[PDB]
Amino acid sequence: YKLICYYTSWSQYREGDGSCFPDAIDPFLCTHVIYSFANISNNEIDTWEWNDVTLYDTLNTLKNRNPKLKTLLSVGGWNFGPERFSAIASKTQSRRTFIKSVPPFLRTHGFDGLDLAWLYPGRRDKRHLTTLVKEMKAEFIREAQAGTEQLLLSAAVSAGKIAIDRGYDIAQISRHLDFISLLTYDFHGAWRQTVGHHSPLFAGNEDASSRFSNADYAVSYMLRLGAPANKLVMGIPTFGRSFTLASSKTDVGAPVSGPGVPGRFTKEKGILAYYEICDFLHGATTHRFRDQQVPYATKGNQWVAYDDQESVKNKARYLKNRQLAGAMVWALDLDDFRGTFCGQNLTFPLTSAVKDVLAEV
Numbered sequence: 001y002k003l004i005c006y007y008t009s010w011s012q013y014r015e016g017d018g019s020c021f022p023d024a025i026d027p028f029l030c031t032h033v034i035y036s037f038a039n040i041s042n043n044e045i046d047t048w049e050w051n052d053v054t055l056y057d058t059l060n061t062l063k064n065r066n067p068k069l070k071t072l073l074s075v076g077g078w079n080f081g082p083e084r085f086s087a088i089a090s091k092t093q094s095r096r097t098f099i100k101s102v103p104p105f106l107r108t109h110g111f112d113g114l115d116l117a118w119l120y121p122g123r124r125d126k127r128h129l130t131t132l133v134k135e136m137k138a139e140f141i142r143e144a145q146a147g148t149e150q151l152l153l154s155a156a157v158s159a160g161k162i163a164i165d166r167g168y169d170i171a172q173i174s175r176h177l178d179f180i181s182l183l184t185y186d187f188h189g190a191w192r193q194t195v196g197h198h199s200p201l202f203a204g205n206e207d208a209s210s211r212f213s214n215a216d217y218a219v220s221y222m223l224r225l226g227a228p229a230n231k232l233v234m235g236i237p238t239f240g241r242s243f244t245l246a247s248s249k250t251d252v253g254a255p256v257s258g259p260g261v262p263g264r265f266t267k268e269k270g271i272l273a274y275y276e277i278c279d280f281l282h283g284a285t286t287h288r289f290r291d292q293q294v295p296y297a298t299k300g301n302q303w304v305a306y307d308d309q310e311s312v313k314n315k316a317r318y319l320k321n322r323q324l325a326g327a328m329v330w331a332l333d334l335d336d337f338r339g340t341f342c343g344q345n346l347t348f349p350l351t352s353a354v355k356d357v358l359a360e361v
């Protein structure tokens with residue numbers, strides 16, 4: 001089984017213990033570590049942070065301890081305008097320029113592959129995305145003639161039914177990608193004024209209409225559209241989504257007024273690292289959706305939807321049972337990487353729980 005783990009650049013800037021550098025990463029934890037995110041300049045792949053080539057080097061030295069570890073560099077991301085990706089892929093010339101710049105860059109910095117985080121292709125992009133994947137893979141096939149191990153090509157893809165139908169030709173890109181990471185953790189959000197979980201495993205026979213916003217539906221749909229289970233990797237959260245309640249009600253459907261108050265370390269409204277949630281739990285009331293198989297907690301007027309060791313192990317068994325290639329974790333810097341916030345002296349409790357199940361039969 002594969003255990004794909006993302007590490008984010010901007011996490012080096014968090015204060016105190018929140019600060020996370022590549023060397024905090026256990027070399028034997030994951031099978032693949034992906035550095036997010038690279039940028040695109042003058043239609044060529046490029047660094048993002050001022051110290052990226054230093055962090056690239058730090059990350060890739062982990063391979064000195066675990067020779068089987070593979071690393072990839074992810075291009076795109078949220079702070080990367082989808083339109084920008086759009087313009088690059090639409091024209092044969094700018095596309096070909098981008099494709100040619102990738103191998104040397106990866107070879108120079110020591111990466112084993114490229115991860116595409118085009119978020120998200122619209123209706124007009126579908127055909128170009130296919131073109132980008134095909135041609136990028138062909139270039140990787142060509143570059144390997146030089147005697148070096150062929151570069152890997154992966155992509156992070158929406159788990160939303162409508163997003164999938166709109167921007168992806170799953171049957172086509174599946175044959176060219178080494179693995180597809182399903183972003184099965186964006187099923188709810190603070191864009192809608194009600195309380196709900198962003199990463200439920202199952203539908204839940206209650207207040208419905210979605211019936212598509214759960215990991216089980218997403219996996220099934222991808223398999224039906226033509227993607228081989230052996231290339232699918234299910235995404236597992238290491239963060240939680242928070243809400244500010246508009247009333248004293250805490251159960252399903254509870255009125256929301258906006259995002260939750262920022263965490264001391266992550267400083268972003270609407271989300272909390274798992275290590276911040278461990279602290280948040282002291283004095284909070286914990287609950288669990290029986291049907292969806294995921295937990296949530298409340299304290300004062302704060303409502304948090306998150307994943308714990310049990311829900312994550314649960315998700316891992318589910319993907320083993322559907323015979324998928326593995327799991328993807330977003331992100332290592334959001335898990336209790338120091339291992340000093342969550343109680344049981346253990347580094348990366350969430351990611352380790354996934355690994356244990358995967359190492360199981």
Ligand SMILES: *[C@@H]1O[C@H](CO)[C@@H](O[C@@H]2O[C@H](CO)[C@@H](O[C@H]3O[C@H](CO[C@@H]4O[C@H](CO)[C@@H](O)[C@H](O)[C@@H]4O)[C@@H](O)[C@H](O[C@H]4O[C@H](CO)[C@@H](O)[C@H](O)[C@@H]4O)[C@@H]3O)[C@H](O)[C@H]2NC(C)=O)[C@H](O)[C@H]1NC(C)=O
Pocket residue numbers: 039040041042047048049
């Ligand atoms: C990721 O990679 C992207 C893509 O390269 C970077 O984004 C580009 O970065 C530069 C610097 O941040 C920006 O450059 C240029 O801005 C001036 C022109 O911008 C115009 O802005 C007006 C808006 O009022 C708009 O009407 C025009 O359409 C145009 O966009 C330009 O004059 C600036 O300067 C130069 O001027 C002369 C050469 O003409 C030279 O003497 C100077 O030294 C200098 O080179 C500058 O070049 C650009 O606006 C920005 N655009 C995009 C696509 O975002 C990112 O910085 C990268 N991200 C990270 C984190 O690095």
